[PDB]
Amino acid sequence: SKYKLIMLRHGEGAWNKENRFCSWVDQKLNSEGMEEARNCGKQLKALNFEFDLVFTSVLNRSIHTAWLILEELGQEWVPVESSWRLNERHYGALIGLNREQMALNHGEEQVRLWRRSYNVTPPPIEESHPYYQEIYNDRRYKVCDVPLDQLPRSESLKDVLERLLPYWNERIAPEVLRGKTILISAHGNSSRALLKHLEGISDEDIINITLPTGVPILLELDENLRAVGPHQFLGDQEAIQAAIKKVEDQGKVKQ
Amino acid sequence: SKYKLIMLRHGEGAWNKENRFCSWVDQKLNSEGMEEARNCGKQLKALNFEFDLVFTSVLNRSIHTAWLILEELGQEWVPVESSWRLNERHYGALIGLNREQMALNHGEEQVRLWRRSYNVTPPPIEESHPYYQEIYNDRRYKVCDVPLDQLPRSESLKDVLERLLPYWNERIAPEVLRGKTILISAHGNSSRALLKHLEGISDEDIINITLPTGVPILLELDENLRAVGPHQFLGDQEAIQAAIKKVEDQGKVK
Ligand SMILES: O=C(O)[C@@H](COP(=O)(O)O)OP(=O)(O)O
Ligand SMILES: O=C(O)[C@@H](COP(=O)(O)O)OP(=O)(O)O
């Protein structure tokens, strides 16, 4: 048989309007991001989706996005599970910094490696970093399945997959094989990591994949939980392609 | 108090202005009801509550109340679990009717009996009722731990406790004993039901218990999960007392 699930990246936040890496900083959605979530819900309602389970990260923007979608669907009673393993990639010391500023300071090539490469690891975030405390003093990281001191201080996309894959195999994949309709409300790079795995994208090719925000991602899997075909985006394709470019352009020097 | 837990009933719903028995009909919170939820979260945050698990009914107003509370607490990550067993008492045929109009026509004492009695079972809702289809056709009841045809069509407060107690004993109680701080976002009568049980309130005394909306109810339990003392409403008692009278007045003429 074949199985379909929905994956999506939450919408806008104050920091991305400023083009700053947010990552593990628990920023809330802004008005726009909230609306993008509701629009995703309306599209899903149009397709008459009836979810059985929802998985999110422990970053509140991921959870609020799910809640907004469920409300649009009148499905607020559907079980939700949140895990740090779906958290956006940890950008380490790059957290809070302006992407275009990084391109000017280190060049576009380096920035593209930091943002999209598979193996490159961002410099780790140190205790002196402006957002260090706000992150590691939060109780949500004191009750994860890994000790607080063992949580990453930065992650390469490969690092993300290593901590996300076990969660997918052990808690999400089984539900898919049981025919459950699943919604994964994740982030830009945690989503790319999952896609890289399910579609068997190469270490090299994954660098060219950029996901637009607030856009339902359609993915169909076979009996072996491997992608039957490339992931697709639900909505106006031209607008989605333009949004993908805007994300890419955030790491480019003006011209 | 070896264990402490918070329970509360959600604020005003979409039918509150009309003062109609909502019960199993899935109406959403109105503007005021949302604020009541937010104020609850603020009050809980001021008292340093850190929840580890939240239980709600499957009625959206109860879930939304929990979500708003969690947001004020910055605890949106805390696990939430929902069950029809925490649903408000099923008002049967009385669903959709105006409380005050009933009081006018049948007498305040009669309506008070229907609302707070422990043993009186309201007339069952019938297929001809305006809100029957809307309730029993909903997918949330298709995936219950009980067959659709087995779900009640009306419930006395005693019936409510009977289908709520199992959920408490099997899912909630164990967590409390594990030291977890729990929040129960329930309803006017399902909350009364749980209180009767936990505080060992008599069949007669339970009739005089009316719970205010949007007010956190602190319950302190011992090793046997039995209330050590009476439930405590967290907030200004005078304002809380008025919130209670508001509920009682819903069944009074004028
Ligand atoms: O790291 C972040 O803040 C972005 C991704 O940024 P880029 O890797 O695309 O630059 O993830 P999001 O929080 O928007 O889901
Ligand atoms: O819908 C209901 O019947 C009320 C209780 O009504 P009364 O027994 O207080 O009249 O429960 P709620 O929806 O507010 O949680």
From Swiss-Prot, chain A:
Domain of life of the source: Eukaryota
CDD domains hit by this protein: HP_PGM_like
Modified residues (N-acetylserine): 1
Tissue: Expressed in red blood cells. Expressed in non-erythroid cells of the placenta; present in the syncytiotrophoblast layer of the placental villi at the feto-maternal interface (at protein level).
GO CC, any one term: extracellular exosome
UniProt catalytic activity: (2R)-3-phospho-glyceroyl phosphate = (2R)-2,3-bisphosphoglycerate + H(+); (2R)-2-phosphoglycerate = (2R)-3-phosphoglycerate
Transmembrane segments: none
SMART domains recorded: PGAM
Binding residues annotated for substrate, in chain numbering: 9-16, 22-23, 61, 88-91, 99, 115-116, 188-189
Record-marked site positions (Transition state stabilizer): 187
Regulation of catalytic or functional activity: At alkaline pH BPGM favors the synthase reaction; however, at lower pH the phosphatase reaction is dominant. Inhibited by citrate.
Site (Not glycated): 28, 45, 142, 180, 245-246, 252
Glycosylation positions in this chain: 2, 4, 17, 42, 158, 196
Disease: Erythrocytosis, familial, 8: An autosomal recessive disorder characterized by elevated serum hemoglobin and hematocrit, and biphosphoglycerate mutase deficiency. ECYT8 affected individuals manifest hemolytic anemia and splenomegaly.
Protein name: Bisphosphoglycerate mutase
